[PDB]
Design a protein around this nucleic acid. Sequence first.
DNA 1: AGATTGTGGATTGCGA
DNA 2: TCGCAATCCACAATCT
Length: 125
Amino acid sequence: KRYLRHDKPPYTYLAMIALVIQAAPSRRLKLAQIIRQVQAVFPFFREDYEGWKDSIRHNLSSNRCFRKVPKDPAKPQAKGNFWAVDVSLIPAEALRLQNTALCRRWQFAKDLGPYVLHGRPYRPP
DNA sequence: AGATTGTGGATTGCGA
DNA sequence: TCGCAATCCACAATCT
Ligand SMILES: [K+]
């Protein structure tokens, strides 16, 4: 299939995943919860493109900041892991608002650092 | 069997 | 001009 950019929130997948994880009482979430929460918290995805869900899954594995946490520490788990974030491994620029066409046509928090790094609750207009 | 989680090779578009 | 997030896809192992 032809590569296409699709409308999405103007924050990295890393940032959005980290934000919803850090907002979870236990600071960890499963994949399906991460997907539902990202869309809920950043509702700039379109009904006609589902591939952002694959990109979320890809970002959990591709970024060192995400940690696969087994239900039982003593028993690693092929599947169904919780995901946590090591904020020390988040690149600083990863949390910055992105200057995309979608950002520009709407003009958003300038940086998600308060919510990911400093325990603040995310509450967008 | 088919769907899902987890991983990862690889190319793209586009902001800087 | 090109770094790099975004994105398309394949696959292994496991869940339903
Ligand atoms: K990871």
